Write a protein that binds this ligand. Structure first.
Ligand SMILES: C[C@H](CCC(=O)NCCC[N+](C)(C)CCCS(=O)(=O)[O-])[C@H]1CC[C@H]2[C@@H]3[C@H](O)C[C@@H]4C[C@H](O)CC[C@]4(C)[C@H]3C[C@H](O)[C@]12C
Ligand SMILES: C[C@H](CCC(=O)NCCC[N+](C)(C)CCCS(=O)(=O)[O-])[C@H]1CC[C@H]2[C@@H]3[C@H](O)C[C@@H]4C[C@H](O)CC[C@]4(C)[C@H]3C[C@H](O)[C@]12C
Ligand SMILES: C[C@H](CCC(=O)NCCC[N+](C)(C)CCCS(=O)(=O)[O-])[C@H]1CC[C@H]2[C@@H]3[C@H](O)C[C@@H]4C[C@H](O)CC[C@]4(C)[C@H]3C[C@H](O)[C@]12C
Ligand SMILES: C[C@H](CCC(=O)NCCC[N+](C)(C)CCCS(=O)(=O)[O-])[C@H]1CC[C@H]2[C@@H]3[C@H](O)C[C@@H]4C[C@H](O)CC[C@]4(C)[C@H]3C[C@H](O)[C@]12C
Ligand SMILES: C[C@H](CCC(=O)NCCC[N+](C)(C)CCCS(=O)(=O)[O-])[C@H]1CC[C@H]2[C@@H]3[C@H](O)C[C@@H]4C[C@H](O)CC[C@]4(C)[C@H]3C[C@H](O)[C@]12C
Ligand SMILES: Nc1ncnc2c1ncn2[C@@H]1O[C@H](CSCC[C@H](N)C(=O)O)[C@@H](O)[C@H]1O
Ligand code: SF4
Ligand SMILES: [Cl-]
Ligand SMILES: [Cl-]
Ligand SMILES: [Cl-]
Length: 347
């Protein structure tokens, strides 16, 4: 079909595999710009002009897993490992709340040391501050997720990475797509607001794989969807592979908004790493969330999932003010509340 025809089907919500494949395969500038406009408009209509700020503290770069794409993979000996103390994490969260953060995201490698009880203790202390707590700690037993929910955690981010089970197992040799999905289903069952999402441009990933990622997200109706380009890391087996394409990744974000109009969708730091101003573009093509880095020195520079991260040389407290300026210059507003999902039930 022509681009005009694909757009019309998207506007009528005929979200067929064929329509999604064609949307991702067409490279016409006019088509792409119309797609981005559509996603921007849907975002405005369903989630408004508030951009929700989630302050992220990357509190440990220790990891037991060996994901082929990730700089924190256990086989990477060329990385100084660190662990923030629970007191450091709590006080760093407190500083973020003092700076106006209404959600605190705790992210780490899969570091056994903290699991589950130290995390629970930290979550309890941060919840006293009257903010939302989101965890992004990887794959753990149901019992750990249960304990963290009881401790007061609100949300959990666990990107599905790739919905192709063969590619998933190759890239993540400690685990499987089946495991990843089971974690996500468990998190939802436990009452977390649950985030999934994927990387774009992984080695061996196809356009049909991207369509499958979109259909998977639509199937499970996730509260949050985190999408970024694959960025090769020099100290990993994928060092010499091609980076994901910014425009294709942007189309995935746009299509995600169109498919899941009331979801929360970040403009990820990976988008701003591969293209200067990439986050700002992404906030205008369907995204409505930003995650300023709140990891303190000297640890921020050591949390290297991928290289070149833009947040690294800035002062400890720079990123919250930075994103507030960003939000204003985009003609948007900061979030007024915790920015939980506001479901619009439809047909
Ligand atoms: C209208 C004025 C003159 C020219 C000068 C530089 C041009 C931009 C840049 O070329 C970068 C980019 C290339 C894409 O292709 C299309 C979009 C974009 C943003 C261009 C838009 C427009 O064309 C600009 C602002
Ligand atoms: C500012 C420049 C140059 C305008 C000019 O100088 N001529 C114009 C030219 C094409 C415009 C983009 C496209 O529309 C696609 C997309 C639609 C969303 O809705 C808002 C985001 C985005 C990326 C737009 C932003 C901006 O508006 C652009 C870059
Ligand atoms: C942390 C310190 C010391 C005082 C303190 O510990 N303050 C706790 C405030 C707690 N809250 C954020 C919940 C207040 C919300 C009030 S509000 O009226 O916005 O609803 C205070 C003193 C001045 C404050 C900055 C300025 O103001 C400018 C700017 C306003 C934005 O907006 C948020 C960002 C920013 C950079 C502010 C951050 C922070 O806050 C500062 C550094
Ligand atoms: C100027 C840089 C390249 C910088 C560099 O690295 N040199 C390139 C890389 C990705 C490009 C954007 C995307 O294509 C999406 C979108 C398509 C619209 O059509 C026009 C607007 C927009 C925002 C594009 C503008 C511009 O063209 C970008 C920022
Ligand atoms: C303190 C730094 C410099 C400046 C740069 C942009 C400013 C914000 C924006 O103006 C939007 C809004 C008004 C209020 C809020 C969030 C402002 C707070 C503060 O004034 C900021 C963060
Ligand atoms: N090289 C790379 N390029 C782009 N994104 C990457 C990347 N390496 C890792 N990521 C992304 O960073 C996200 C957080 S990894 C940290 C949280 C947890 N260990 C977990 O695995 O879920 C991953 O879900 C992945 O999508
Ligand atoms: S993606 Fe998460 S689990 Fe995999 S190596 Fe990186 S930090 Fe560890
Ligand atoms: Cl969140
Ligand atoms: Cl994310
Ligand atoms: Cl990212």
């Amino acid at each position: 079909m022509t681009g005009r025809e694909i757009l019309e089907k998207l506007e009528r919500r005929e979200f067929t595999r064929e329509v999604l494949k064609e949307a991702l395969s067409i490279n016409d500038r006019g088509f792409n710009e119309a797609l981005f406009k559509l996603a921007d408009e849907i975002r405005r209509k369903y989630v408004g002009d508030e951009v929700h700020i989630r302050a992220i503290i990357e509190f440990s770069n220790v990891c037991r897993k060996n994901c082929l794409y990730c700089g924190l993979r256990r086989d990477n000996k060329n990385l100084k490992r660190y662990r923030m103390t629970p007191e450091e994490i709590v006080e760093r969260a407190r500083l973020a709340v003092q700076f106006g953060a209404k959600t605190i995201v705790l992210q780490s490698g899969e570091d056994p040391y903290x699991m589950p009880d130290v995390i629970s203790d930290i979550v309890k202390e941060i919840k006293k501050m009257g903010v939302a707590v989101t965890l992004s700690l990887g794959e753990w037993p149901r019992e750990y997720y249960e304990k963290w929910k009881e401790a007061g955690a609100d949300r959990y981010l666990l990107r599905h990475e790739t919905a192709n089970p063969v590619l998933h197992r190759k890239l993540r040799p400690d685990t499987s797509f089946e495991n990843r999905l089971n974690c996500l289903l468990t998190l939802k069952e436990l009452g977390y607001e649950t985030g999934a999402g994927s990387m774009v441009g992984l080695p061996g990933q196809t356009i049909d794989d991207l369509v499958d990622d979109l259909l998977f997200l639509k199937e499970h109706d996730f509260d949050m969807v985190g999408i970024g380009p694959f960025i090769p890391h020099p100290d990993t087996p994928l060092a010499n592979e091609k980076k994901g394409d910014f425009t294709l990744t942007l189309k995935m974000v746009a299509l995600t908004r169109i498919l899941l109009p009331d979801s929360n969708i970040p403009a990820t730091t990976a988008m701003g790493t591969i293209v200067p101003g990439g986050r700002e573009i992404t906030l205008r093509c369907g995204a409505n969330v930003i995650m300023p880095n709140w990891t303190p020195s000297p640890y921020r520079q050591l949390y290297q999932l991928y290289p070149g991260k833009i947040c690294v040389f800035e002062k400890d407290t720079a990123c919250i003010p930075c994103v507030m300026k960003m939000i204003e210059l985009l003609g948007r507003k900061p979030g007024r509340d915790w920015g939980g999902r506001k479901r619009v039930f439809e047909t």
